[PDB]
Write a protein that binds this ligand. Structure first.
Ligand SMILES: [Zn+2]
Length: 811
């Protein structure tokens, strides 16, 4: 059964099947014979990897000792350190310690029962993997899969890589000159160790490089009898002609994951079958796989051809618009466009990612969806598992899976809620650009940078210029020098009410088509039962949203976190006059008899139950001013199409916490002008003083429970046994505990150092920029949403949006 092609909405191939010329090596045919006493394997291998490099070919290399800047590391080890970084836990030296504290933090948020957390692991582990989360560690031995694979892989010839690369270098299996460059020796091992691995018994010869041109085939063919047993083979592949174009939506094919083998065998696969592992390749696996065929023969039915809703052309402009901005942001200089051209202030380093989505606002069809960084699906078709090369994982679809403070783009939502509760748009404030309720300041961007104001401001100017002060005022229904009520009743609860109406609390429609981790409207009631639960246990303000909480919310910061895909529906609701639209990336399937089904044909178009839909017309007035004389004028003021926009830069106050807080403090202990030995000993002393102190307090407790005459005399025995031995309370060896005490040792031994000064080496959360638009504003077709995390300037998010709206509208 040839696998079903994926096409864009207009028939252009996005994923198909082709044949590839590929180089193969034979396990025995190369290894000659011992009678010759020629282990020629090391010669034909060294020539093959150097023949390939000289010809410029990508070659297979699963050899688990890689060179990264003069040092030798384990791949098995990297998977450990880097998997743990993407599951939020300190990457230290215990597998159990890492399993039990991750499970503890997902069970912390309604995963299951807290008592079915502490339950025999054979019953537990199986069921959490059953739930649908992968099991990367081993139940019985409590070791990382990769750890086992390392012990097994070395027991096939327990510490160090540079050592292991020495011992494996001259082990029985290989035997290299021991007079060759570890660079030449390493490249010999890529080949020999692939042969050893791909089978203790293998079907056939192993493939060492895949796609390879004429001038590299020839150099192999007309090099016969020199590289004995190096073949040019034909083998088919999945291929994605436009490479990394729309990678995240397309997905990729690969070997079934080890864990799911039983499913796939029962479902009727073989273990060497390529299967969809992400995006539309996964969700339409069954549809794309077709149905297999077999005296007599039945022909195989080929996979239905799946058409996405993407426009390859618009996808191209989107994908490049992000590659350029990210390259140009960090000391790039210029953004070359076909509308204007912006010279880019090169003060934006550390911006290493972006997300854009364009949707049809009438039927939710996704016309362009781009995430940076991205990945070539073609690399997975030939064979890999990790690209790689606060780092953003390229496999992550930031459009569907990037929960982000929505920023300025939330202001229309706050404004919608104000109008729905009686706001007169004309309501004008004499804007100071700043509000104080702590010593802490809440001010405009123009106030944090120039102590500027918006002078006299109604709702339209508030939107036009992104007035945080005006948003705070209508968000609370109160002017903030005095806290006097305005006409209207508003508060966080009403703000999150409209967050909920614009679908921010729910999945987009793409969840079953591609991987999505939708955002959740921050819960009022979770925050009350959060603190009550923490209050009950302590007895043995922070319960309601504060005025500052309400401020931060009203300006799309605080506990707000939504995906670009979610926001696009929000925006689209304004554009289409108040219909929540269910997004779709999969439009049509077409059978191998030219019969056709529309798949997104039943997508929901709910009318949002707004008090007065005509209030969305007040936002559009505000959003047009953004484009003509607002924060988007630099891009859209001289633009041939009438655009509604909202644009802004936002700052997220504070420092990104580290993997290991204890180790951070040990790093910078000289910079604190503190002796490290002094700090550690004083830290221990203070723990011990807390341990001794808690022990004497635990005695008093047990004795008071023992004086309770009416007490079951089998627990009385427990208490006596606890106390009999003498009570030695010990602090939990958490990174949080050891960090707290080393920090208090730092402040004692340096009595003038502050918390900010200790934390100064941490990375700031930094700044981000959204632009959101629909066009043409008076009869909208398309909405575009673009976020640049770690973005200094509104330009970074403005220009990709312009390119895409221009392309779509025919310019
Ligand atoms: Zn203002």
């Amino acid at each position: 059964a040839p696998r079903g092609e994926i096409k864009d909405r207009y028939g252009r191939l996005l994923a198909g099947n082709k044949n590839l010329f590929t180089v193969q090596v034979s396990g025995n045919d190369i290894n000659k014979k011992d009678a010759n006493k020629h282990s020629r394997a090391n010669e034909i291998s060294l020539k093959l990897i150097n023949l390939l490099e000289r010809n410029g070919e990508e070659y297979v290399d699963e050899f688990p000792i890689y060179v990264e800047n003069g040092k030798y590391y384990y791949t098995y080890d990297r998977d450990i350190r880097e998997y743990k970084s993407e599951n939020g836990i300190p990457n230290d030296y215990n597998a159990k310690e890492s399993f039990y504290y991750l499970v503890d933090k997902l069970i912390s948020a309604g995963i299951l029962s807290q008592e079915d957390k502490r339950l025999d692991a054979t019953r537990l582990q199986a069921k959490l993997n059953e739930n649908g989360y992968y099991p990367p560690i081993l139940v019985s031995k409590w070791m990382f899969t990769a750890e086992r694979d390392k012990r097994d892989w070395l027991a096939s010839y327990k510490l160090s890589a540079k050592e292991a690369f020495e011992k494996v270098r001259n082990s029985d299996a290989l035997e290299i000159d021991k007079s060759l460059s570890d660079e030449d020796a390493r490249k010999i091992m890529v080949v020999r160790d692939l042969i050893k691995s791909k089978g203790y018994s293998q079907y056939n010869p192993v493939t060492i490089a895949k796609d390879v041109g004429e001038t590299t085939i020839a150099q192999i063919e007309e090099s016969a009898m020199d590289l004995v047993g190096v073949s040019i083979a034909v083998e088919p592949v999945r291929y994605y002609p436009n490479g990394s174009l729309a990678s995240h939506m397309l997905g990729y094919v690969g070997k079934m994951p080890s864990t799911q083998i039983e499913s796939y065998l029962q479902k009727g696969y073989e273990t060497g079958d390529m299967v969809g592992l992400a995006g539309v390749e996964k969700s339409n696996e069954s549809r794309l796989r077709g149905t297999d065929g077999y005296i007599e023969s039945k022909k195989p039915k080929s996979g239905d051809t799946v058409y996405l809703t993407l426009d390859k052309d618009l996808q191209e402009v989107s994908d490049n618009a992000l590659k350029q901005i990210i390259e140009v942001a960090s000391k790039g200089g210029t953004f070359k466009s076909k509308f204007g051209d912006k010279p880019i202030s090169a003060y934006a380093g550390k911006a290493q990612s972006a997300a854009l989505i364009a949707i049809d606002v009438k039927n939710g069809e996704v016309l362009a969806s781009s995430s940076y960084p991205n990945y070539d699906p073609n690399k997975f078709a030939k064979g890999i598992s990790t690209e790689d090369y606060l780092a953003g994982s390229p496999l992550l679809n930031l459009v569907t899976q990037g929960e982000f403070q929505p920023g300025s783009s939330f202001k229309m939502l706050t404004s919608m809620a104000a109008l729905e509760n009686g706001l007169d748009p004309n309501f004008t404030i004499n804007d100071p650009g700043v509000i104080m309720l702590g010593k802490k300041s809440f001010g405009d961007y123009v106030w944090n940078h120039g102590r500027g104001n918006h002078g006299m401001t109604n709702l339209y100017k508030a939107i036009q210029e992104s007035c945080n002060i005006y948003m705070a005022t209508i968000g609370t229904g109160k002017t903030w020098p005095d806290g006097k009520s305005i006409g209207i009743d508003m508060n966080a609860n009403k703000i999150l009410e409209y967050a909920k109406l614009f679908g921010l609390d729910q999945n987009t429609g793409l969840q079953d088509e591609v991987e999505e981790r939708a955002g959740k409207v921050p819960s009022t009631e979770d925050k009350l039962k959060s603190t009550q639960a923490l209050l009950k246990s302590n007895l043995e303000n922070f319960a309601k949203w504060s005025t500052a909480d309400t401020f931060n919310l009203a300006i799309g910061q605080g506990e707000n976190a939504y995906t670009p895909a979610q926001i696009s529906r929000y925006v689209a609701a304004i554009a289409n006059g108040g219909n929540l639209v269910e997004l779709s990336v999969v439009d049509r399937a077409v059978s191998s008899d030219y019969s056709s089904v529309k798949i997104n044909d039943q997508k929901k178009v709910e009318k949002i139950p707004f008090k007065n839909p005509d209030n969305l017309k007040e936002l559009t007035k505000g959003m047009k001013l953004v484009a003509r004389q607002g924060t988007a004028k630099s891009a859209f003021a001289d633009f041939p199409i009438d655009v509604a926009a909202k644009t802004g830069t936002a700052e997220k106050s504070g420092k990104i916490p580290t993997d290991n807080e204890y180790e951070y403090l040990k790093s910078h202990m000289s910079s604190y002008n503190v002796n490290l030995n002094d700090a550690i000993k004083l830290a221990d002393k203070m723990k011990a003083e807390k341990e001794k102190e808690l022990s004497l307090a635990k005695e008093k407790e047990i004795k008071k429970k023992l004086e309770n005459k009416d007490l079951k005399d089998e627990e009385r025995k427990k208490l006596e046994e606890e106390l009999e031995d003498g009570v030695k309370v010990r602090l939990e060896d958490t990174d949080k505990v050891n960090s707290s005490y080393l920090r208090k040792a730092i402040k004692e031994l340096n009595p003038k150092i502050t918390d900010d000064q200790i934390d100064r080496f941490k990375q700031d959360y930094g700044s981000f920029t959204w632009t959101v638009a629909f066009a043409p504003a008076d009869d909208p077709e398309i909405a575009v949403v673009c976020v640049i995390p770690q973005g200094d300037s509104s330009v970074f998010s403005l220009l990709p949006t312009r390119e895409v709206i221009g392309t779509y509208m025919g310019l």
